[PDB]
Amino acid sequence: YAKKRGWVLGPNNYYSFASQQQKPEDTTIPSTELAKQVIEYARQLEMIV
Amino acid sequence: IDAFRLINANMMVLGHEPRQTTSNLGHLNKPSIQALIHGLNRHYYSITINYRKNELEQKMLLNLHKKSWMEGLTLQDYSEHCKHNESVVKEMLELAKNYNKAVEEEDKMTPEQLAIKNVGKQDPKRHLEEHVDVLMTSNIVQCLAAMLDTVVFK
């Protein structure tokens, strides 16, 4: 596991790499696809005509 | 508006507006009872009116009256929009209270498909969905109008 992956034994301590990202801010990706979902409602509130 | 036109009194033994050339003179004017009592048709007669409509006068007449720029992309100011939807849900609530008893009692007592629930009624399945029809068009537009400015205005 030390030669393939990380887990480097140093001063009697392993070190596994780790992070995280952040995304609550994007109202923009539910802006385009929601606009598609609202129109395809109103497309189908008519058109069997 | 109407236009009239005097006929001579000497030609009262022959035709007055005679000599049928066409057959379009019958559906362009139908004189009502209040018109044929004063002078029609022994004194004067009526004449047909059409409207000389052309371009660069008629199209620009509507290119300036019933037009808009920002009316589509403008919010309905939710202080009274969702306040309006309160008084629409509550009234179709009462029509749904009215709808529950009405049809099912009528069908289970007598199957006549007829009288006083046919001659002078107003609570069919014509009244309960037009409030739903107004409530969609007022909101599906209003939902989608607030979707554009999220993309367009950053």
Which residue is closest to A34 within chain B, CA to CA?
Answer: B147
Declared resolution, Å: 3.5
CB A32 within 8 A of CB B151: yes
Q: In A10-19, which positions are buried (b, 16+ CB within 10 angstroms) versus exposed (e)? A: eeeeeeeeee
Inter-residue long-range contacts of B27-32, CB under 8 Å, 24+ positions, other chains counted:
none
- Give me A35's structure tokens: 């606009």
- Within 8 A of B140 by CB-CB distance, chain A residues are 38, 41-42, 45
CB B75 within 8 A of CB B145: yes
Paired residues of B44 in beta bridges: B6
Residue in this structure with the two tokens 């139908």, named with its chain if needed: B30
CB B152 within 8 A of CB A28: no
- CB-nearest partner of B140 from A28, A31, A38: A38
Residues B36 and B29: their CA atoms lie apart, in Å, by 12
Is B143 close to A45, i.e. CB distance below 8 A?
no
Alpha-carbon separation of residue B144 from A47, B67, B75, B100 (angstroms): 19, 21, 10, 34
Alpha-carbon separation of residue A47 from A41, A43, B10, B57, B115 (angstroms): 11, 7, 65, 36, 36
Paired residues of A14 in beta bridges: none
